[PDB]
């Protein structure tokens, strides 16, 4: 009947309006946000240990580049080394070639740093834009340094946006750079439990599971965004003039009936993906990073210098536990609306 078709269409559209354009009420949103925050968390937890500044063309093109992190700010030197007596050396990691299972090039580190800074600044300056929203433009700042014949600081401007698609791309760059090139990690001088003190572990050796989980979080979050635009551009129209057999022809009614199913199947896959992203967060957060990624509140390395002596390296400082609960609290609201959704799909299956 007309009231039944109209009740189902309204339920789909009410849930679709929240799922697509909502923030705190949307598990699609909170899942995406979790993915983003999880990569920031990953980098904040173990980024400082990533060995960088191996040479790309030659050992005689000896380059360095320092990368700044602001907060209680810190700086990370790629290329150099620390001498026996404690002074800085311009010959260090740049004496050995950059590749898989060795060291990130300066070029690879500057992408992680750029991506991280865009992502960090976007989530603070403007939050994540809603998933159906086109996004809001915003300027990111990226502060680096080189050495001269004196040290030269340079802060770059990047015109970026806070739409999921862009922000997921930045996260993807961080995870895939680690996942694919597996740079070695710095050890303790004889701090997290995973940073050994003995030899020095390979990042994909230490964080293989975590990198895959972090990677899968992004792939699923992107899939959420694609099913959300499918959903957005697939809104069934309410039946008006119900008795009018010319206006409401069985053709454009079966069109609507299967337009409703596309709306429902997107919502299913989105909620399914969102629940996978939570499963993927548990994979990420329950190995080496269990006591680290979820919290925030003095650790060092020889390629690191702090403005003060505090800094927040070693633990995630990305509000992932807060976002995890928001994802759980939003997903149970949609998980109990399934009776309404299954009433509509069975009703739709008729036409």
């Amino acid at each position: 009947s007309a009231q039944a078709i109209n009740q189902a269409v309204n339920n789909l559209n009410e849930r679709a309006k929240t799922l697509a354009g909502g923030t705190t009420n949307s598990p699609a949103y909170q899942a995406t946000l979790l993915a983003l925050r999880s990569v920031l968390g990953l980098w904040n937890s173990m980024g400082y240990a990533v060995i960088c500044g191996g040479y790309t063309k030659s050992p005689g093109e000896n380059n360095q580049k320092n990368f700044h992190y602001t907060d209680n700010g810190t700086t990370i030197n790629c290329g150099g080394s620390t001498n026996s007596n404690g002074t800085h050396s311009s010959n260090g990691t740049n004496t050995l070639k950059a590749d898989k299972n060795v060291s990130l090039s300066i070029e690879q580190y500057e992408k992680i740093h750029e991506s991280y800074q865009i992502l960090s600044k976007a989530l603070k300056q403007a939050g994540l834009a809603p998933l159906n929203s086109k996004g809001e433009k915003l300027e990111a700042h990226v502060t680096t340094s080189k050495y001269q014949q004196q040290t030269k600081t340079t802060t770059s401007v990047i015109d970026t946006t806070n739409d999921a698609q862009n922000l997921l791309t930045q996260a993807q760059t961080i995870v895939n750079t680690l996942k694919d090139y597996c740079p070695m990690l710095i050890a303790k001088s004889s701090t997290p439990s995973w940073q050994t003190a003995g030899g020095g572990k390979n990042s994909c050796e230490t964080f293989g599971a975590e990198f895959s989980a972090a990677s899968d979080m992004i792939n699923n979050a992107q899939k959420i965004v694609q099913e959300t635009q499918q959903l957005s551009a697939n809104q069934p129209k309410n039946i008006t003039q119900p008795h009018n057999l010319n206006l409401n022809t069985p053709s454009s009614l079966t069109a609507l009936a299967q337009k409703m199913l596309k709306n429902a199947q997107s919502q299913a896959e989105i909620l399914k993906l969102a629940n996978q992203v939570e499963s993927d967060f548990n994979k990420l957060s329950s190995g080496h990073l269990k006591d680290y990624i979820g919290k925030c509140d003095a650790i060092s390395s020889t390629n690191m210098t702090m403005q003060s002596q505090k800094n927040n390296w070693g633990n995630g400082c990305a509000g992932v536990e807060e976002t995890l609960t928001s994802l759980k609290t939003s997903a149970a609201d949609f998980n109990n609306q399934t009776p309404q959704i299954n009433q509509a799909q069975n009703l739709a299956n008729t036409l």
Binding site: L96, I186, A187, G199, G200, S301
Partner: protein
């Protein structure tokens, strides 16, 4: 304590070989590199080795008779008079702290 080099033989004959042994190599390394001359200088790099890798990456100074080993020693065969003088090893330990050491052999 200190990283030191030893040339075997100490003085070499032209066309024969020399072995720069490494004493007191610290455990736990990221990698190391051998240089021609007194200075750690990129353009004089003969070869660099990374601990996980299995293969060593030569530099500009690689003449083609240099065999680095994974105990950090360097064999140089078919020595010329042009091989006279100093050779320098830089080690990068796992904590990114470097150590240096110089070697020399005299050819006759």
């Amino acid at each position: 304590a200190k990283l030191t080099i030893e040339s075997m033989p100490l003085s070499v004959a032209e066309g024969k070989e020399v072995l720069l042994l490494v004493h007191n190599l610290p455990q736990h390394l990221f990698g190391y590199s051998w240089y021609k001359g007194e200075r750690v200088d990129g353009n004089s790099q003969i070869v660099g080795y990374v601990i996980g890798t299995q293969q060593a990456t030569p530099g500009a100074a690689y003449s083609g008779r240099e065999t680095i080993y994974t105990n950090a020693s360097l064999l140089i065969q078919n020595v010329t008079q042009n091989d006279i003088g100093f050779y320098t090893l830089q080690v990068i330990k796992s904590d990114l702290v470097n150590e240096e050491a110089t070697g020399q052999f005299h050819v006759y």
